[PDB]
C-alpha cells in the first residue's frame with residue numbers, strides 16, 4: 001500500500017520530504033565520530049524546530065510500502081566527495097546509516113514499512129533488519145539493528161512534505 | 164507611530180512567544196561565528212539552506228509588541244556552548260558593527276526598535292537608537308550589522324508551531 | 325622549595341616559553357571539553373605524536389620553585405575565545421576540568437608544581453592534584469578528589 | 483640529479499619522516515581549502531609559530547635526488563577523510579590546490595624537488611615546468627600549482 005505523508009497524502013518520488021522522528025527536530029547529516037569526517041551519518045537534531053535536511057525518494061510516481069526505494073538528501077552544498085544517498089556502513093561495528101551510496105545499486109535499498117498503532121508512522125527496513133538509533137558524537141545516529149523486524153528498537157519516522 | 168507588529172499570519176506579535184525571524188527579501192536567521200578570530204559570542208547569519216526556518220527568538224519589553232518601542236531579541240535554544248546570553252546586541256569594538264549574542268535583555272545596549280519597511284505588509288526592519296540593521300558578507304554568509312544611517316535588512320516574523 | 329627543572333635539567337624561568345609535555349601522543353593543547361562548551365577551553369593531550377603542545381609561560385604572584393604558588397598561561401598569537409589564556413579550575417563542572425580564562429593575579433589560578441614518582445625532571449600540578457579524564461578530543465586535564473596524578477615535564481621552546 | 487639535503491645538510495632518505503618547513507608561522511599541515519570542501523584536504527602554512535608541521539615521508543617510484551619523480555605522503559596515526567595521505571593536484575579547482583588523496587604509485591602524485599634561489603638546503607616543488615606556490619585561503623596560505631613556495635626539509639627527531 002502507498003506510503004503517506006503527515007497530511008495523509010500519498011508519497012511521490014522526486015518530491016522533497018523532511019524525514020521527521022515520529023517518536024528535538026528532524027534528521028540531518030553529521031559525522032558519526034571524530035575518526036570519520038566523510039561520509040556523513042544521519043542524526044536527530046536536538047534543536048526542536050529544525051525540520052531536518054530534506055530528502056527525495058527514488059524507486060529503481062507513487063512510493064509504496066514493502067518496495068525497494070533509495071533515500072537521497074537534497075542540499076545546495078555538499079563538502080564530502082561522495083553522494084547524498086543513504087546506505088549502510090558495513091565496515092563499522094555500529095552499522096551506521098551513512099551517505100555516499102549508489103541510488104541505482106542494491107546497497108542503498110531500504111523498504112518503508114508500517115510502525116505500531118498510529119497512522120502515517122513508518123520504519124525503515126533493510127533486506128528483515130530495521131533501522132534504529134545509537135548514541136553518537138552529535139546525538140542519536142541512525143543504525144541498522146540486528147533485528148527480526150519488530151518495532152521494538154526501530155526508529156519510527158514520519159514524512160513531512162517540504163512546502 | 165506605535166502600532167502592533169504583526170507576524171506572517173497578520174496576527175499581532177506577543178512577548179515570550181517563539182518566532183523565526185525570516186528574511187523578507189536561503190532560509191532564516193541563525194547563530195554563526197563572524198570570523199575565524201572570534202568564536203564567542205556569535206553573529207547572526209542568513210542560512211543558505213532553503214528550508215531551514217532559522218533559530219527561533221523570543222521578544223521581550225523592558226503582552227503586545229509595538230512598532231517604534233524598545234524591545235530585546237533573545238535566541239531560544241536548549242544548548243548554548245558560549246559562556247554568554249542568547250540576547251542580541253551590537254559589537255561596538257568591531258569596525259563592521261556586527262549584531263552579536265551575549266547582550267543584557269534588561270540593559271539599553273540590547274534595545275532595538277521594530278519599524279515598518281517599504282514594500283508589503285508584515286515586513287519590518289530593526290533600528291537602533293536612527294541606525295538600521297543591514298547585512299554584510301562574512302565567513303558563513305550574510306551577517307547582520309548596524310548601518311551608519313536602502314541598506315536595511317527586511318524581516319518578517321513567522322510564528323513557530 | 326627547590327627549583328623546578330626543564331627536560332635539560334636547567335632551572336625553570338618565569339616569562340619563558342615551555343611546552344608542558346606528558347611525562348608518561350604529543351604535548352598539551354587547548355581544545356573544547358565537550359559539545360556543550362566552546363569557550364573557555366580545556367587542556368587536552370594531542371594524539372599526534374610530534375606536536376610539541378601549545379607553549380606556556382609561568383608567572384609568580386626569575387626562578388620557578390616547587391611547592392610555590394604559580395600561574396600557567398598559554399602563549400599564542402591568536403585567541404578566539406573572549407577570555408584569558410591562564411589556566412584555572414572549572415568549579416561548575418562535575419569533572420573539575422582545568423580550563424582557560426583564569427586571572428593570573430588571582431588565587432583561583434594558583435597551582436603548585438611538585439615532584440612526581442621515580443624519574444628526574446618529572447612533576448605534577450597540585451592537596452588536590454591534576455589528573456586526566458576521557459573527553460571529546462582525548463585525555464583532558466582535571467582536578468582529582470581530596471596514583472591518579474598526570475605526570476608532566478617542561479620542555480624549553482627553542 | 484644531485485641529492486636533496488635536509489636542514490642539517492644531510493642527504494634525504496626515503497621512508498623517513500620530515501617536516502616540510504617554509505624556507506621563507508610554522509610548518510605545513512592539512513586543512514580544508516574552503517567551506518565547500520571538507521575532504522580531501524589542502525596543505526596550509528600554520529600561523530602558530532612553534533608548530534613543526536605534519537610530518538611527511540617521501541617515496542620514489544634510499545636517496546632522494548633533485549629533478550626526479552617523487553611522491554609526498556603525510557604521516558599521521560589518524561586520518562578522518564576516506565582517501566590517501568599522498569599529495570596531488572586538484573585539477574577540477576580554478577586555484578589548482580595541492581590536496582591529499584593521490585595515488586603514490588600513479589603519475590598524478592609525482593612532484594620533483596628542485597633547488598631554489600641562493601641559500602643552501604632550500605628547495606621548491608615542481609610538477610611535470612609548473613612550480614608549487616601559495617594562495618590565500620580559509621586557514622592561511624595554501625599550496626597551489628602555479629601556471630614558487632620555497633621549502634626546507636627538517637628531520638623529525
Ligand code: CHL
Pocket residue numbers: 033034035036037202353354355356362365368369370371372375376377378400401402403404405461462530533560562
Ligand atoms: C576553539 C575550539 C578548539 C577546538 C575544538 C580545538 C581542537 C583541537 N585542538 Mg586546539 N582546539 C580549539 C582551540 C585552540 N587550539 C589552539 C592550539 C592548538 C595546538 C597547538 C594544537 C591543538 C590541537 C587540537 C586538537 C587536539 C586533539 C587531537 O589531537 O586531534 C587529532 C587531530 C585531528 C586533525 C583529527 C581530525 C578530526 C576531524 C574529525 C575533524 C576536526 C579537525 C580540526 C583540526 C578540528 C576543527 C576545529 C579547529 C578549527 C580547531 C583538536 C583538533 C593539536 C592538534 O592536533 O592540531 C591539529 C595541537 O597540536 N590546538 C589554540 C591556540 C591558538 C586555540 C584557541 O582557540
Ligand code: CHL
Pocket residue numbers: 037199200202372375402404511512513514517520523526527528529530533534535536558560561562563621622
Ligand atoms: C576538516 C579537517 C581539518 C580542518 C578544518 C583543519 C584545520 C586546521 N589544521 Mg589540521 N585541519 C583539518 C584536518 C587535519 N589536520 C591535521 C593535522 C594538523 C596539524 C599538525 C596542524 C594542523 C593545523 C590546522 C590549522 C591551520 C591554520 C592555523 O594555523 O590555525 C590557527 C589555530 C587556531 C586554533 C585558530 C583558531 C580558530 C578556530 C579554533 C575557530 C573554529 C572554526 C569554526 C568552528 C569552523 C570549523 C568548521 C569546519 C571548517 C571544519 C587549522 C585549524 C595546525 C594548527 O594550528 O594546530 C591547531 C597544525 O599544527 N592540522 C590532520 C592529520 C591528523 C588532519 C586530518 O584530517
Ligand code: CHL
Pocket residue numbers: 028029030031034037040043044045046047050051052053075076077078079080138139212215242244356359360362520
Ligand atoms: C562534518 C560535517 C558536518 C558536521 C560536523 C555536522 C554537524 C551537525 N549538523 Mg550537519 N554536520 C555536518 C555536515 C552537514 N550538515 C548538513 C545539514 C544540517 C542541517 C539542516 C542541520 C544540521 C545539524 C547538525 C548538528 C546536529 C547536532 C545538533 O543538534 O547540534 C545542536 C548544537 C549546536 C548547533 C551547537 C553545538 C556547538 C558546536 C558549535 C560545537 C563544535 C565544536 C568544534 C568546533 C568541533 C567541530 C566538529 C568537527 C568534526 C568539524 C551538528 C552540529 C542540525 C542543527 O542543529 O543545526 C546546526 C540541523 O538542523 N546539519 C549538510 C547539508 C548542507 C552537511 C554537509 O556537509
Ligand code: CHL
Pocket residue numbers: 047050077078079193194195196202205208209210211212215216217218240241242243244245303304362516517518519520
Ligand atoms: C562557533 C559556533 C558556530 C558555528 C561555526 C556555526 C556555524 C553555522 N551555523 Mg550555527 N554555528 C555556530 C553556533 C550555533 N549555531 C546554532 C544554531 C544554528 C541553526 C538553527 C542553524 C545554524 C546554521 C549554521 C551555518 C550557517 C551557514 C550555512 O547556511 O551553511 C550551510 C552549509 C553546511 C551545513 C555545510 C557544512 C560546511 C562544512 C565545511 C563545515 C562543517 C559543518 C558543521 C555543521 C559546522 C561546524 C560544526 C559546528 C561548529 C556547528 C553554519 C554552519 C544553519 C545551518 O546551515 O545548519 C547546519 C542553521 O539552520 N546554526 C546555535 C544554537 C544551538 C549555536 C550555539 O552556539
